[PDB]
Amino acid sequence: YSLYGVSGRGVFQNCTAVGVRQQRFVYDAYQNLVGYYSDDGNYYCLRAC
Amino acid sequence: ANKFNQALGAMQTGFTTTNEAFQKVQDAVNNNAQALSKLASELSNTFGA
DSSP: OOOSSOOOOOOOEEOOOOSOSSSOOOBOSSSOBOOOOOSSSSOEEOOOO | OHHHHHHHHHHHHOOTTTOTTHHHHHHHHHHHHIIIIIHHHHHSSSOOO
8 A cells, every 4th residue: 555644565454443533544552553544435454564 | 188179179260360370471471472572563663763
């Protein structure tokens, strides 16, 4: 993928359902994003390589 | 025999949490799991300038 200001390499899946949903990432306690948003409008949660 | 089996019975029931040895066991699994995964999470994302 290559999203807005963020790079990265991930395996998107239609996951559920944890986030903010108004701004459009979700991190897990580090710099990484685990990982949905951005698609319109679902939950494409990402993973590491 | 019933006192031996009673002793082993309380040895069955009591693991968590106030019965270290067992907290030593999870100090070990949390030790090497902490070192591995958590130190490797400090090593990457992020360190540098």
